[PDB]
C-alpha cells in the first residue's frame, strides 16, 4: 500500500446539461463525464506527505482544458495571429463558468491535504485519498481571483518563495468581497465596478498585517502595475461574453489602509471599465476582434476571493516592500484552487 509521485492524463467530470446553450455546459457535455455519484474519500492514517502547488501537473492540464474551452466557445469576428487574417461568424454566447472536477484513471489517485492552514508548499499532516477533486470554476481573470474558494480560518499567503521577486504571490482571503460590474442600458463600451470601500479597505488592512508577518514587520506599500500589456495592467475578465478591462488604482489606495484611519475612504469604490473588442490571444501571440456589446444592462456580481501580487525587490537600502497587482500567468488561478491536490500512482 505505497505510492509514488507521478503525472498522468486526467479526465473531467461535471453536472453539464446537454440541452443547455451555455458554452461551458456545451464543452463539458462532450469533454467530461457526469460527476461521481458516489465519491469515496478515505483518510490516510497518520501519513505525512509533501505537496508543492507551484510544481503540479494538474495545473497545466487544467490550463490546456481552459484553452480548448475558450477556443471552442468564444468566436471572434476576426483573428489576426501571424500572417493570418481569418474572418468568421461571431455570435454572442451564453457564458457562465460551471465547476469542473478533475479525476485520475485506474492505477492513480489524488492525495488531498486537509490541513486548515495549508499554504500550498511543504509537509501535510491530514492526508486523504480521493478519485476526483471538488468542482472548480475555470474563472479567467487578472489581478483578482473571483468566484473561488476561501481560506478556512486565516488569510493565507502562497508563494514558491516569498524572497524570490520572480515568484508570484497568491493571497487567499477568508472573507469574500463583492465586486459588482455594470454596463448600464443606454458610450456602449463604458462600464464600472462597484466595491464596498469600508469592507474592502478593512480586508486590505488585514492583508497588509499578514504580509507584515512574513516580511519582518516591514512597511507594506501597494502600487499600480509598472507596465505590461493591458490584459495584466488592468483587471480583465469575461462577463456574459464581454471582455471587461477595469482600472484598479482605487483598490490599492494606501492612504485608506493606514492605522490613523479617517479620510473619505469608506464610501463606494467605483472602478472605471471598458468593454474591449480587440483582445490579445492567450494561446499564441495574436489579436482577436469581437463584435460590440449587446444592448441592455450587462451586469456581473462576483466574489473577490484572492489577490495575485508581485513584489518589487531590488530593495536593499530601504525599509519597505512594494507590491503590485498581477501575476506570472493564468495557471496561478488554477493553482489557487488545486493547491490541496496532487496526483500519485499506486503500485
Amino acid at each position, epitope marked *: 500500500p505505497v505510492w509514488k509521485d507521478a503525472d498522468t492524463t486526467l479526465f473531467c467530470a461535471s453536472d453539464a446539461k446537454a440541452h443547455e446553450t451555455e458554452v461551458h455546459n456545451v464543452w463539458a457535455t462532450h469533454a467530461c463525464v457526469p460527476t461521481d455519484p458516489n465519491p469515496q474519500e478515505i483518510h490516510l492514517e497518520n501519513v505525512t506527505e509533501n505537496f508543492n502547488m507551484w510544481k503540479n501537473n494538474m495545473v497545466e492540464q487544467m490550463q490546456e482544458d481552459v484553452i480548448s474551452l475558450w477556443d471552442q466557445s468564444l468566436q471572434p469576428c476576426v483573428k489576426l495571429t501571424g500572417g493570418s487574417v481569418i474572418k468568421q461568424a461571431c455570435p454572442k454566447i451564453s457564458f457562465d463558468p460551471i465547476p469542473i472536477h478533475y479525476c485520475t484513471p485506474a492505477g492513480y489517485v489524488i492525495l488531498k491535504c486537509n490541513d486548515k492552514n495549508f499554504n500550498g508548499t511543504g509537509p501535510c499532516k491530514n492526508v486523504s485519498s480521493v478519485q476526483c477533486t471538488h468542482g472548480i470554476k475555470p474563472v479567467v481573470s487578472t489581478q483578482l481571483l473571483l468566484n473561488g474558494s476561501l481560506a478556512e480560518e486565516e488569510i493565507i499567503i502562497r508563494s514558491e518563495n516569498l524572497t524570490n521577486n520572480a515568484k508570484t504571490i497568491i493571497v487567499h482571503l477568508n472573507k469574500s468581497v463583492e465586486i459588482n460590474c455594470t454596463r448600464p442600458s443606454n458610450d456602449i463600451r463604458k462600464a464600472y465596478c462597484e466595491i464596498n470601500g469600508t469592507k474592502w479597505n478593512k480586508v486590505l488592512k488585514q492583508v497588509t498585517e499578514k504580509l507584515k508577518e512574513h516580511f519582518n514587520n516591514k512597511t507594506i506599500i501597494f502600487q499600480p502595475p509598472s507596465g505590461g500589456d493591458l490584459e*495584466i495592467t488592468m483587471h480583465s475578465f469575461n462577463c456574459r461574453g464581454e471582455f471587461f478591462y477595469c482600472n484598479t488604482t482605487q483598490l490599492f489606495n494606501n492612504t485608506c489602509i493606514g492605522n490613523e484611519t479617517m479620510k473619505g475612504c469608506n464610501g463606494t469604490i467605483t472602478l472605471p471599465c471598458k468593454i474591449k473588442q480587440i483582445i490579445n490571444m492567450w494561446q499564441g501571440t495574436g489579436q482577436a476582434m469581437y463584435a460590440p456589446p449587446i444592448d441592455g444592462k450587462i451586469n456581473c456580481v462576483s466574489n473577490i476571493t484572492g489577490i495575485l501580487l508581485t513584489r518589487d*525587490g531590488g530593495a536593499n537600502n530601504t525599509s519597505n516592500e512594494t507590491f503590485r497587482p498581477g*501575476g506570472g500567468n493564468i495557471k496561478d488561478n488554477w493553482r489557487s484552487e488545486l493547491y490541496k491536490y496532487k496526483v500519485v500512482q499506486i503500485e
Partner: antibody, heavy 127, light 98 residues
Framework: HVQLVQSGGGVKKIGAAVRISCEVS????????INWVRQAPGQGLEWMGW???????????????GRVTMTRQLSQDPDDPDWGTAFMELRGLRVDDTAVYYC?????????????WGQGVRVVVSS | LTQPASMSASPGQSVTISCSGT????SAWFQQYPGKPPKLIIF???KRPSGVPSRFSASRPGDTASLTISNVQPEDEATYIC?????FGGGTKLTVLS
C-alpha cells in the same frame, strides 16, 4: 545552444534615451524571463529589472522606476516561434548612467541564478 | 552582500573570498575577467557547472558564503562576485602575484 546577442549601444547625449536589444535563440522565448543588469566601469553588478515575455509584465528596481521600460518583440511566423527579442530603454540619461549593460536569464523553469548572459553593450553619456 | 574590494595570492596557494549578508539565501558565484561578461562558476551553494575547474569550491552554512580556490593559477586573476537572486556583491578582485 542558448544564445543572447545584444545590440544598440554607444555614445549618447546628456538627457536623451537609449534602447538596447537582446535577441535570443536556442529556446522558447516565452518560457524564460529576461533580466537586465548594468555595470559601471570598475563597479559591481546592478540588477535593473526583469520582464516576463508572456504578457510583458515587468519588475523594476526603485533606482530605475519611472526611467526604464522593458518590452518584447515576439515571433510571428509559425515555422519559427521559439525566436524572440527583448528590449530595454533608459530615458533621461546622465553621465552616471555610463555602464556596460547585459541581458541575462536563468536556468530552465526559473529566473535565478543567471546562468546565461549576453555579451554586453557599452553606453557612454557625455556632452 | 559585502565582500572585500580585492584580494591577493601566489601561484599554488589556496585563497578564500567571503561574502556576508546573503540572508540565508542559496546564492551563486560568478567569475568575471576585465572587459568580459560574468560567467557562473557556482550555483546551489556548492555545485559547479561543466567546464569549471575542480579547484573551485564554495559553501554557505549560514549568513556567510565562501568561495575557496585551491592550487591558485594565474588564470584565476579575475573578479569574483557573490549573488543572491537579484543582489550582487561588490566583487572581489583576486590578483595572482606575478
Amino acid at each position: 545552444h542558448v544564445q543572447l546577442v545584444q545590440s544598440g549601444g554607444g555614445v549618447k547625449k546628456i538627457g536623451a534615451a537609449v534602447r538596447i536589444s537582446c535577441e535570443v535563440s536556442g529556446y522558447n522565448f516565452m518560457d524564460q524571463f529576461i533580466n537586465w543588469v548594468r555595470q559601471a566601469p570598475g563597479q559591481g553588478l546592478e540588477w535593473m529589472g526583469w520582464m516576463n515575455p508572456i504578457y510583458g509584465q515587468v519588475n523594476y528596481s526603485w533606482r530605475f522606476q519611472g526611467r526604464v521600460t522593458m518590452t518584447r518583440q515576439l515571433s510571428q511566423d509559425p515555422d519559427d516561434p521559439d525566436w524572440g527579442t527583448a528590449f530595454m530603454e533608459l530615458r533621461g540619461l546622465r553621465v552616471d548612467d555610463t555602464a556596460v549593460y547585459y541581458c541575462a536569464r536563468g536556468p530552465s523553469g526559473e529566473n535565478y541564478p543567471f546562468h546565461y548572459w549576453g555579451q554586453g553593450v557599452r553606453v557612454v553619456v557625455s556632452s | 552582500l559585502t565582500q572585500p574590494a580585492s584580494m591577493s595570492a601566489s601561484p599554488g596557494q589556496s585563497v578564500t573570498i567571503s561574502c556576508s549578508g546573503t540572508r540565508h539565501i542559496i546564492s551563486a558565484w560568478f567569475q568575471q575577467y576585465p572587459g568580459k561578461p560574468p560567467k557562473l562558476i557556482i550555483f546551489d551553494d556548492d555545485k559547479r557547472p561543466s567546464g569549471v575547474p575542480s579547484r573551485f569550491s564554495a559553501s554557505r552554512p549560514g549568513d556567510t558564503a565562501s568561495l575557496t580556490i585551491s592550487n591558485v593559477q594565474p588564470e584565476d586573476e579575475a573578479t569574483y562576485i557573490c549573488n543572491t537572486y537579484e543582489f550582487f556583491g561588490g566583487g572581489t578582485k583576486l590578483t595572482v602575484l606575478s
